Motif scaffolding. Structure first.
Motif, PDB file in Angstrom:
ATOM      1  N   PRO A 153      34.052   7.226 100.651  1.00  0.00           N
ATOM      2  CA  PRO A 153      35.240   6.672  99.973  1.00  0.00           C
ATOM      3  C   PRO A 153      34.909   6.436  98.194  1.00  0.00           C
ATOM      4  CG  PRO A 153      34.304   5.066 101.289  1.00  0.00           C
ATOM      5  CD  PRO A 153      33.663   6.235 101.660  1.00  0.00           C
ATOM      6  N   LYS A 154      35.506   7.122  97.533  1.00  0.00           N
ATOM      7  CA  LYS A 154      36.004   6.633  95.899  1.00  0.00           C
ATOM      8  C   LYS A 154      37.064   5.895  95.851  1.00  0.00           C
ATOM      9  CE  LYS A 154      32.223   9.175  96.243  1.00  0.00           C
ATOM     10  NZ  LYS A 154      32.444   9.166  97.655  1.00  0.00           N
ATOM     11  N   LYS A 155      37.329   5.674  94.605  1.00  0.00           N
ATOM     12  CA  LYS A 155      38.410   4.820  94.112  1.00  0.00           C
ATOM     13  C   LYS A 155      39.579   4.684  95.061  1.00  0.00           C
ATOM     14  N   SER A 156      40.036   5.750  95.709  1.00  0.00           N
ATOM     15  CA  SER A 156      40.989   5.833  96.660  1.00  0.00           C
ATOM     16  C   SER A 156      42.272   5.200  95.969  1.00  0.00           C
ATOM     17  CB  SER A 156      40.632   4.958  97.963  1.00  0.00           C
ATOM     18  OG  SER A 156      41.837   4.771  98.858  1.00  0.00           O
ATOM     19  N   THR A 157      42.844   6.007  95.075  1.00  0.00           N
ATOM     20  CA  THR A 157      44.169   5.587  94.486  1.00  0.00           C
ATOM     21  C   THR A 157      45.192   5.409  95.358  1.00  0.00           C
ATOM     22  OG1 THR A 157      45.016   7.819  94.024  1.00  0.00           O
ATOM     23  CG2 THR A 157      43.203   7.042  92.675  1.00  0.00           C
TER      24      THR A 157
ATOM     25  N   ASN B 221      43.458  13.693 100.276  1.00  0.00           N
ATOM     26  CA  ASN B 221      42.519  13.417 101.517  1.00  0.00           C
ATOM     27  C   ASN B 221      41.436  14.549 101.327  1.00  0.00           C
ATOM     28  OD1 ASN B 221      41.637  11.727 103.326  1.00  0.00           O
ATOM     29  ND2 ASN B 221      42.866  12.570 105.121  1.00  0.00           N
TER      30      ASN B 221
END
Ligand SMILES: *[C@@H]1O[C@H](CO)[C@@H](O)[C@H](O)[C@H]1NC(C)=O
Lengths: 49, 36
Positions: free
Chosen positions: A24-28, A41
């Protein structure tokens, strides 16, 4: 010529199933109803939502 | 005491979802009108 490594492997699957796994990055947070690109995704595309 | 098949063994090939798609496939599937 047989120094030690304990073999390691990749894992990878080609879209044939549910999507569940990625680091997971920032997961806007999402928007809609305005033709904007998505990297949704990991599966990417442009158009509207 | 064998018994013939009519219509059995029909499964969507993968988790993917097609929609109104007159599509075709091939894998280890059930031979048709065979007798179980
Ligand atoms: C199904 O196939 C077997 C093998 O030839 C046959 O004996 C039988 O009469 C066939 N029909 C059936 C089981 O209804």
């Amino acid at each position: 010529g047989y120094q030690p490594y304990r073999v390691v492997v990749l894992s990878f699957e080609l879209l044939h199933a549910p999507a569940t796994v990625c680091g997971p990055k920032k997961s806007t947070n999402l928007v809609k109803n305005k033709c904007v690109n998505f990297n949704f995704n990991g599966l990417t595309g442009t158009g509207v939502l | 005491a064998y018994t013939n098949s009519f219509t059995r063994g029909v499964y969507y090939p993968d988790k993917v979802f097609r929609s109104s798609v007159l599509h075709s496939t091939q894998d280890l599937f059930l031979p048709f009108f065979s007798n179980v």
